[PDB]
Scaffold this motif. Structure first.
Motif, PDB file in Angstrom:
ATOM      1  N   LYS A 116       1.867   1.686  -3.690  1.00 33.91           N
ATOM      2  CA  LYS A 116       0.714   2.251  -4.383  1.00 33.91           C
ATOM      3  C   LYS A 116       0.569   3.732  -4.060  1.00 33.91           C
ATOM      4  O   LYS A 116       0.310   4.558  -4.950  1.00 33.91           O
ATOM      5  N   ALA A 117       0.759   4.088  -2.787  1.00 34.39           N
ATOM      6  CA  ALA A 117       0.702   5.487  -2.385  1.00 34.39           C
ATOM      7  C   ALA A 117       1.753   6.312  -3.109  1.00 34.39           C
ATOM      8  O   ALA A 117       1.513   7.482  -3.420  1.00 34.39           O
ATOM      9  N   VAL A 165       0.826  -1.203   0.000  1.00 31.44           N
ATOM     10  CA  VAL A 165       0.000   0.000   0.000  1.00 31.44           C
ATOM     11  C   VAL A 165       0.862   1.257   0.000  1.00 31.44           C
ATOM     12  O   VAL A 165       0.453   2.298  -0.529  1.00 31.44           O
ATOM     13  N   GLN A 166       2.057   1.196   0.591  1.00 31.74           N
ATOM     14  CA  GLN A 166       2.954   2.346   0.549  1.00 31.74           C
ATOM     15  C   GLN A 166       3.455   2.599  -0.870  1.00 31.74           C
ATOM     16  O   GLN A 166       3.549   3.753  -1.309  1.00 31.74           O
ATOM     17  N   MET A 212      -7.090   7.961  -3.692  1.00 30.54           N
ATOM     18  CA  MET A 212      -5.797   7.663  -4.296  1.00 30.54           C
ATOM     19  C   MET A 212      -5.896   6.457  -5.217  1.00 30.54           C
ATOM     20  O   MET A 212      -5.320   6.451  -6.312  1.00 30.54           O
ATOM     21  N   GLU A 213      -6.619   5.420  -4.787  1.00 27.86           N
ATOM     22  CA  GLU A 213      -6.818   4.250  -5.635  1.00 27.86           C
ATOM     23  C   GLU A 213      -7.540   4.623  -6.921  1.00 27.86           C
ATOM     24  O   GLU A 213      -7.168   4.165  -8.007  1.00 27.86           O
ATOM     25  N   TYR A 236      -2.882   5.156   2.367  1.00 33.45           N
ATOM     26  CA  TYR A 236      -3.509   4.895   1.079  1.00 33.45           C
ATOM     27  C   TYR A 236      -5.021   4.880   1.254  1.00 33.45           C
ATOM     28  O   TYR A 236      -5.562   4.033   1.974  1.00 33.45           O
TER      29      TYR A 236
END
Length: 131
Positions: free
Chosen positions: A45-46, A42-43, A115-116, A111
């Motif tokens: 992806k962030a 998730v980091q 953001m997604e 996240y």
């Protein structure tokens, strides 16, 4: 009172955003090849979201340079000119310092769904503001 309005034809904007996001993403991939092991999924992806938001907030300032080069062509531009200029920005702006700061200060953003949604967008559809 009158000031020339700021805007760009959609095809030109698309070329720029595609190339800029691709370049920032390449730089993030290299950075992750060095630093990726300690980061959660998730980091990372962030961090991709950070690329797209970074393009969004610096967009107008970049448009100053883009407009200067386009004018310096001396002719009406075509999509390929904006493709080249966008790839130049994507390559020449090194985001590694920024990733370093986010990691070292533990500021990598949490996240969240918005953001997604931005990350799932095609680069062509990422919204930008000229004015």
């Amino acid at each position: 009172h009158y000031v020339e309005p700021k805007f760009l034809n959609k095809a030109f904007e698309v070329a720029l955003k595609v190339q800029i996001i691709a370049g920032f993403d390449r730089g993030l991939v290299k950075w992750l090849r060095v630093h990726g092991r300690t980061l959660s999924t998730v980091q990372k992806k962030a961090l991709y979201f950070v690329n797209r938001r970074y393009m969004q907030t610096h967009w107008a300032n970049y448009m100053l340079w883009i407009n200067k080069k386009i004018d310096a062509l001396g002719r009406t531009p075509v999509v390929g000119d904006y493709t080249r200029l966008g790839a130049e920005i994507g390559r020449r702006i090194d985001m590694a310092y920024f990733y370093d700061f986010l990691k070292d200060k533990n500021m990598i953003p949490k996240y969240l769904p918005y953001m997604e949604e931005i990350n799932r967008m095609r680069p062509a559809d990422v919204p930008v503001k000229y004015m």
